[PDB]
Amino acid sequence: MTADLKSLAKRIYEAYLKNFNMNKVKARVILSGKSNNPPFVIHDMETLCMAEKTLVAKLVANGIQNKEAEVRIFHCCQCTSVETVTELTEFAKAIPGFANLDLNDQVTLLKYGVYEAIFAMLSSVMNKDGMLVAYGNGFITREFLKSLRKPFCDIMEPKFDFAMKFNALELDDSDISLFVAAIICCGDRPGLLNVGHIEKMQEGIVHVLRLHLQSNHPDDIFLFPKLLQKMADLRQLVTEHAQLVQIIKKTESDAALHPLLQEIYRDMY
Numbered sequence: 001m002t003a004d005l006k007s008l009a010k011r012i013y014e015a016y017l018k019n020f021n022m023n024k025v026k027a028r029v030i031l032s033g034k035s036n037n038p039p040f041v042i043h044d045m046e047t048l049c050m051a052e053k054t055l056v057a058k059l060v061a062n063g064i065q066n067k068e069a070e071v072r073i074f075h076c077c078q079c080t081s082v083e084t085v086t087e088l089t090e091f092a093k094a095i096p097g098f099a100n101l102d103l104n105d106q107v108t109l110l111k112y113g114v115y116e117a118i119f120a121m122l123s124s125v126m127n128k129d130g131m132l133v134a135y136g137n138g139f140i141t142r143e144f145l146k147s148l149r150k151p152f153c154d155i156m157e158p159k160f161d162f163a164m165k166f167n168a169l170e171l172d173d174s175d176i177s178l179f180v181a182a183i184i185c186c187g188d189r190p191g192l193l194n195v196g197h198i199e200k201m202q203e204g205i206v207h208v209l210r211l212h213l214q215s216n217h218p219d220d221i222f223l224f225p226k227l228l229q230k231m232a233d234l235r236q237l238v239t240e241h242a243q244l245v246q247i248i249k250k251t252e253s254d255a256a257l258h259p260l261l262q263e264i265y266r267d268m269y
């Protein structure tokens with residue numbers, strides 16, 4: 001007559017496999033070079049423009065009215081975030097207690113948590129040379145993103161830096177699913193109404209995470225505190241990312257921000 005924490009961990013993992021279009025196994029199969037619709041490599045302007053014509057044709061169907069390359073890239077980044085936000089919102093229903101919260105608290109938790117979760121999961125599609133994009137159908141190089149004009153070259157590099165260290169922890173999907181659930185369940189988000197119930201939701205999911213890591217990673221006795229630190233690092237990465245997005249908003253008139261993301265950023269930090 002106790003909670004079955006192993007079963008809860010499996011429920012979380014299954015919800016993550018169902019709700020996210022990309023997972024670490026799927027990404028690694030693509031990244032390894034394994035036969036139908038392999039990713040198109042974007043390493044320079046020529047290959048960016050070829051990939052766009054095949055994979056996002058509408059965005060470049062405007063002739064002389066097409067936006068600048070960097071702005072098109074930023075638009076594609078935002079489309080990816082909007083999709084991942086939708087996936088995270090459905091995933092969160094699997095977290096014990098989340099769907100029992102008031103709707104406004106669900107919204108606040110997702111508002112602060114989504115970009116932390118986005119950058120954690122992005123590590124799964126990154127290696128030291130580049131990252132998968134467009135539902136696994138493109139691979140854009142880290143050097144190409146660094147070559148973009150300021151401020152757009154400053155978007156991805158800190159995320160690659162985070163990812164290389166995160167990937168060295170050698171987490172699998174069963175671990176990452178619980179880490180993402182724990183990110184969402186933070187009782188210290190600004191503006192929460194029912195802090196007490198959220199704190200107990202957080203305690204429960206972090207307990208599931210700690211026990212799972214103990215079992216799944218017997219070789220790394222500090223993995224749990226390492227991941228607690230990664231959550232704090234992600235909060236700082238998101239604060240800095242939001243500051244850069246605000247610079248883009250103020251100084252780049254063509255880089256329209258999608259309304260869902262503007263709402264996430266509004267009053268965030």
Ligand SMILES: CC/C=C\C/C=C\C/C=C\C/C=C\C/C=C\CCCC(=O)O
Pocket residue numbers: 048051052055056072073074076077078080081082122133134138140155245261
């Ligand atoms: C063929 C063109 C398609 C894709 C290549 C262009 C851009 C890369 C796409 C996605 C990159 C992945 C994640 C985006 C990272 C940070 C989010 C920045 C925008 C935001 O603040 O929501």
